[PDB]
Amino acid sequence: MLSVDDCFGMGRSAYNEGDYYHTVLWMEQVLKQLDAGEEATTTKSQVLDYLSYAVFQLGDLHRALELTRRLLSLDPSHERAGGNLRYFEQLLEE
């Protein structure tokens, strides 16, 4: 298997090609390996930024809201994430 940072780079590669499904596959793997305590340069908050947008593109509304909340929890001055959270709470009334 690949390293956490290799998987992250695979996910960013897919995102930059506009391939949101494969972004989700790679970034879910990154989060899994980070929860296994594997060493890595990438932070959880950076992974959640790509993942939350990618799952929204795929149509997964409450999951995108959940992940955006998690992103803001770990990076409170992230203004774009705060803007995303306001969008999803207004859209989903939650």
Partner: peptide, 8 residues
């Protein structure tokens, strides 16, 4: 609109 993802 609308959520905004990472620039790159």
């Amino acid at each position: 609109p609308g959520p905004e993802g990472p620039p790159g």
